Amino acid sequence: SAMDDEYTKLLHDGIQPVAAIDSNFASFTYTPRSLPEDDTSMAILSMLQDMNFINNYKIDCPTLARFCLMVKKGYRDPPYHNWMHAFSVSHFCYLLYKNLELTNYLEDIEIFALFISCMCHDLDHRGTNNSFQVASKSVLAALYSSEGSVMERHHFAQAIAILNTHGCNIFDHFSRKDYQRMLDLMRDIILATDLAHHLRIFKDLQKMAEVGYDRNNKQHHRLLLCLLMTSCDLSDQTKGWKTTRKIAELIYKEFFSQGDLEKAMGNRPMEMMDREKAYIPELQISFMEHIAMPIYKLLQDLFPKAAELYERVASNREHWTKVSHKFTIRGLPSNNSLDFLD
Numbered sequence: 433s434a435m436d437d438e439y440t441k442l443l444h445d446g447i448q449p450v451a452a453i454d455s456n457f458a459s460f461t462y463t464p465r466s467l468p469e470d471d472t473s474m475a476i477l478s479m480l481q482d483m484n485f486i487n488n489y490k491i492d493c494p495t496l497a498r499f500c501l502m503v504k505k506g507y508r509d510p511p512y513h514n515w516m517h518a519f520s521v522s523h524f525c526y527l528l529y530k531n532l533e534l535t536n537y538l539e540d541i542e543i544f545a546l547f548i549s550c551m552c553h554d555l556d557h558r559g560t561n562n563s564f565q566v567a568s569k570s571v572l573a574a575l576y577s578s579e580g581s582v583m584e585r586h587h588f589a590q591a592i593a594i595l596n597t598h599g600c601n602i603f604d605h606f607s608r609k610d611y612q613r614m615l616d617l618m619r620d621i622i623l624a625t626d627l628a629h630h631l632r633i634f635k636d637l638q639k640m641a642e643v644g645y646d647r648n649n650k651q652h653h654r655l656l657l658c659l660l661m662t663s664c665d666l667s668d669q670t671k672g673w674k675t676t677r678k679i680a681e682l683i684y685k686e687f688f689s690q691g692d693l694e695k696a697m698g699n700r701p702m703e704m705m706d707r708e709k710a711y712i713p714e715l716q717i718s719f720m721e722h723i724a725m726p727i728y729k730l731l732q733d734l735f736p737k738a739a740e741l742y743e744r745v746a747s748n749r750e751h752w753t754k755v756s757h758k759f760t761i762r763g764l765p766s767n768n769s770l771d772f773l774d
């Protein structure tokens with residue numbers, strides 16, 4: 433058994449200090465996708481230890497090791513929505529913890545729930561979106577289409593199934609109230625990763641940042657968790673140009689594959705899913721200006737120390753404008769041939 437030996441080492445070898453992973457591991461400039469995939473489960477444990485969650489919540493180490501491996505094994509391998517995405521999203525949550533004084537805003541258990549939700553938030557993603565579940569009449573749509581956020585409901589359900597697997601419930605010593613609270617938080621945070629949900633609550637996020645965060649307002653806690661979750665989910669946009677470029681390639685590979693499946697079903701894909709129509713520079717610039725930048729602007733509004741994140745998203749978007757011309761074939765192609773016109 434592969435997992436058996438990995439677990440044995442994860443449990444008995446001990447947890448490496450975060451600085452041994454990388455000297456800049458806790459910096460906004462660090463790219464967690466640089467970490468070898470084989471080192472990521474150990475890194476998850478290192479972060480959990482460094483954030484004091486293991487000690488504070490007296491988490492059972494064998495259970496935690498099993499849980500971490502089960503979560504990793506709970507991702508498939510589409511180009512983008514894979515374990516390295518969940519890992520990098522979890523890492524950014526850790527960065528927010530290390531850089532932004534979250535304990536002035538959120539309860540301990542909320543910060544814990546955010547991180548665990550990050551690990552779990554895309555579990556068993558098949559590389560297709562919510563619309564496709566309904567159009568393809570998938571099992572997931574049969575279960576959840578009446579509620580909406582089909583994939584995100586599945587991700588949450590998958591997280592619960594892992595918890596309900598013997599030897600994996602890292603919360604099973606919790607008081608009844610804390611257990612209920614944790615699972616309720618995971619529901620809210622994972623369901624908040626549906627961009628439709630973000631767009632619905634965006635006005636509320638703005639009003640929150642306008643009036644100023646009120647740590648005594650429970651709805652403010654809820655809203656901030658949603659924003660932070662979204663900030664983690666999109667955090668590839670806050671690194672360098674190379675990260676944005678590669679993640680664009682991964683996402684559109686995933687998108688265009690869905691589009692191919694939609695065409696074969698006799699449906700016409702969204703433009704951004706259609707490899708014959710999608711003009712990537714326009715599409716990325718649009719996503720950055722209309723989705724990613726406003727999120728990190730709000731984050732900056734609430735946390736001044738997060739200004740560098742917004743400025744690098746803006747910087748990355750500007751670089752897309754600058755390379756857009758490259759999508760136009762000047763002169764002859766690659767191979768000196770016009771055969772592709774046929």
Ligand SMILES: COc1ccc(Cl)c(-c2nnc3c(C)nc4ccc(C(=O)NCC(C)C)cc4n23)c1
Nearest residue numbers: 625626627662665666679680683704715716719723
């Ligand atoms: C947070 O939940 C998700 C779920 C899935 C994805 Cl792929 C993303 C996500 N993460 N990075 C990206 C980038 C770089 N570009 C994207 C361009 C479009 C869309 C998309 O789904 N647009 C449809 C809607 C806006 C009408 C998502 C994009 N995205 C986030």
Ligand SMILES: [Mg+2]
Nearest residue numbers: 553554625626
């Ligand atoms: Mg998702």
Ligand SMILES: [Zn+2]
Nearest residue numbers: 517553554665
């Ligand atoms: Zn995600």
